[PDB]
Amino acid sequence: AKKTPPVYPVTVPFLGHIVQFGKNPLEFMQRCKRDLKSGVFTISIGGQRVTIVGDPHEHSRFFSPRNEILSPREVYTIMTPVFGEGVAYAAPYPRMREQLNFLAEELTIAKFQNFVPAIQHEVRKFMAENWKEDEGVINLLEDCGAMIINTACQCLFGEDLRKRLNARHFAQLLSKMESSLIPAAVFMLPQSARCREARAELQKILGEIIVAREKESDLLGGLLKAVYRDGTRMSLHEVCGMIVAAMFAGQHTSTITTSWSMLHLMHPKNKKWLDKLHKEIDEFPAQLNYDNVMDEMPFAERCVRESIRRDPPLLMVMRMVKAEVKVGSYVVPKGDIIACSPLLSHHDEEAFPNPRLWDPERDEKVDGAFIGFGAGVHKCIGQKFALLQVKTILATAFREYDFQLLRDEVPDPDYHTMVVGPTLNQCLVKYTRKK
Ligand code: HEM
Numbered sequence: 001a002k003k004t005p006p007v008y009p010v011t012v013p014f015l016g017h018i019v020q021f022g023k024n025p026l027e028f029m030q031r032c033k034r035d036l037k038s039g040v041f042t043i044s045i046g047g048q049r050v051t052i053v054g055d056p057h058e059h060s061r062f063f064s065p066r067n068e069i070l071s072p073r074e075v076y077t078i079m080t081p082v083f084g085e086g087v088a089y090a091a092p093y094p095r096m097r098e099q100l101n102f103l104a105e106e107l108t109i110a111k112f113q114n115f116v117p118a119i120q121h122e123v124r125k126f127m128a129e130n131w132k133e134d135e136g137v138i139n140l141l142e143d144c145g146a147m148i149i150n151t152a153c154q155c156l157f158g159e160d161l162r163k164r165l166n167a168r169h170f171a172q173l174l175s176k177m178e179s180s181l182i183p184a185a186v187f188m189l190p191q192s193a194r195c196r197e198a199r200a201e202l203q204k205i206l207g208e209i210i211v212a213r214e215k216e217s218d219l220l221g222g223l224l225k226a227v228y229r230d231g232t233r234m235s236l237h238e239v240c241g242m243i244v245a246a247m248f249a250g251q252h253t254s255t256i257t258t259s260w261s262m263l264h265l266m267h268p269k270n271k272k273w274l275d276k277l278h279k280e281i282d283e284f285p286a287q288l289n290y291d292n293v294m295d296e297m298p299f300a301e302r303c304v305r306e307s308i309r310r311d312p313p314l315l316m317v318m319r320m321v322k323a324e325v326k327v328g329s330y331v332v333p334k335g336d337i338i339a340c341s342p343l344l345s346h347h348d349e350e351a352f353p354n355p356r357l358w359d360p361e362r363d364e365k366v367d368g369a370f371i372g373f374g375a376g377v378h379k380c381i382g383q384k385f386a387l388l389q390v391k392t393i394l395a396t397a398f399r400e401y402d403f404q405l406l407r408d409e410v411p412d413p414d415y416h417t418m419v420v421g422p423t424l425n426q427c428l429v430k431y432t433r434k435k
């Protein structure tokens with residue numbers, strides 16, 4: 001308006017809206033958009049202006065500008081110690097940029113050939129060490145959280161590295177490094193000591209693994225050959241983070257996505273889809289190749305995307321408005337915190353009629369509406385990988401099994417975590433091994 005978008009009333013001040021927010025952001029965010037007569041709007045959070053972009057037409061405005069205009073570094077100040085000063089968001093954009101490439105060139109579909117089979121294997125194991133019986137009660141959020149970590153390491157970890165680390169141990173270290181995070185952080189330590197310990201431990205372990213490599217093509221090795229613009233290379237420090245960042249990025253996001261996808265599918269209300277998910281994975285063999293998942297599982301791919309569409313794991317993508325930028329009919333003043341929310345966006349009823357309904361064969365009725373993997377200058381570099389894991393798993397686990405939920409309703413998102421997934425205590429599921 002030659003000026004800033006609409007704002008929202010602060011009943012109890014200098015808290016902002018994190019009071020009514022934290023309980024349910026979706027209930028909340030929807031109130032404001034309807035109430036404020038605008039898909040876009042600003043909110044108070046600790047006195048700090050937060051402008052949420054909730055009109056899907058506008059996503060382009062959010063995801064297109066380069067970091068110098070809209071910086072994401074300021075949001076993730078939280079974890080500079082988790083990856084190391086000068087790694088990821090901690091690094092400078094030119095370097096941060098270069099690092100992104102390194103990881104990217106490690107996850108391209110060029111490296112994905114052994115992956116498919118490497119995946120079928122690691123899951124099939126897990127189940128036999130766990131779903132031993134022909135009827136069992138298992139917590140899916142936890143059983144998935146594990147398989148994802150397993151198969152990912154089976155994919156990006158060298159045989160020698162995986163001998164000196166096992167998923168279990170490595171996960172428990174990521175979960176050591178993580179627990180030093182609390183909800184109100186982006187808007188304002190013996191844990192930094194436990195964070196640095198679990199890290200310095202890993203950082204050392206890795207180096208050793210290197211001593212043995214040289215003296216004699218995985219993610220590690222890949223990052224080793226990595227050369228910066230100026231011919232400089234990564235310090236073990238920088239390296240270490242990168243592997244963590246990679247592993248962290250995919251850990252919760254992927255497992256949750258797998259959990260939800262399974263949760264939807266094992267539902268009776270959702271049988272036809274499961275039935276379609278079979279006419280798909282039926283004539284395949286217990287030996288899956290790249291062609292199989294990639295070019296022949298298209299329906300399955302819809303289910304995973306829908307699940308991410310319905311319950312996005314990252315509710316808010318955020319930037320720092322170093323400079324002004326027009327957004328629809330409004331402007332954004334330097335110093336604002338702008339954000340775009342996949343959770344809000346994926347519920348806009350123009351783009352998604354019955355947003356809470358789970359429809360795999362639905363398509364976005366506003367191009368760009370779906371952002372589960374981001375968009376623009378920052379689209380997910382892990383997207384292709386995550387999908388390959390999840391598709392193969394659902395296929396693996398639905399081929400040799402049938403499922404039922406100890407519930408009537410699929411679980412409810414738990415909004416108390418920085419990375420949202422289905423309510424843990426609801427996930428307990430029970431399997432009937434096929435034969
Ligand atoms: C299916 C699960 C996944 C979901 C829901 C997801 C979601 C997202 C979202 C919303 C962004 C953009 C964030 C922003 O705009 O600031 C993003 C980018 C990113 N993702 Fe993921 N992702 C997933 C899988 C993965 C996996 C498996 C990896 C690791 C290989 C990964 C690594 C990254 C990295 C490094 C970026 C950087 C984007 C940037 O800052 O330019 N993601 N993802």
Ligand SMILES: Cc1cc(Oc2cccc(Cn3ccnc3)c2)cc(C)c1Cl
Binds near residue numbers: 088245248380
């Ligand atoms: C910027 C960056 C982020 C990386 O992963 C992250 C780190 C923090 C937050 C996110 C957001 N995310 C989660 C899942 N997909 C993206 C992803 C990894 C690397 C190597 C780099 Cl350079």
